[PDB]
Design a protein around this ligand. Structure first.
Ligand SMILES: [Ca+2]
Lengths: 17, 89
């Protein structure tokens, strides 16, 4: 459920990629 | 076979960990020791644009529970990220 890619955008969208 | 997940974890740089450490916290916002049990995880879902039930949420925990504790930790969680590295299936 939910891909790290998405969990990285929402939960921690800032300071990401 | 081998460990394509357990190996990656150890082969993680401060660049990645710094990111994982983020969720880990939000994934345990209100925990007692520092684990997850849906009650905390689900909290993020609502923000992630979803909202899984407590009966299913376990999946996000049982998907990386090699201890039989039920809750996820920096050891189980971390892997939960490697498994969902990139989509190319
Ligand atoms: Ca566990």
């Amino acid at each position: 459920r939910m891909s790290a890619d998405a969990m990285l955008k929402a939960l921690l969208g800032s300071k990401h990629k | 076979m081998d460990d394509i997940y357990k190996a990656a974890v150890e082969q993680l740089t401060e660049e990645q960990k710094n990111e994982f450490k983020a969720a880990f916290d939000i994934f345990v916002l209100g925990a007692e020791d520092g684990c997850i049990s849906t009650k905390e995880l689900g909290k993020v879902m609502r923000m992630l644009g979803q909202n899984p039930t407590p009966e299913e949420l376990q999946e996000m925990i049982d998907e990386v529970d090699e201890d039989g504790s039920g809750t996820v930790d920096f050891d189980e969680f971390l892997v939960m990220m490697v498994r969902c590295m990139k989509d190319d299936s």
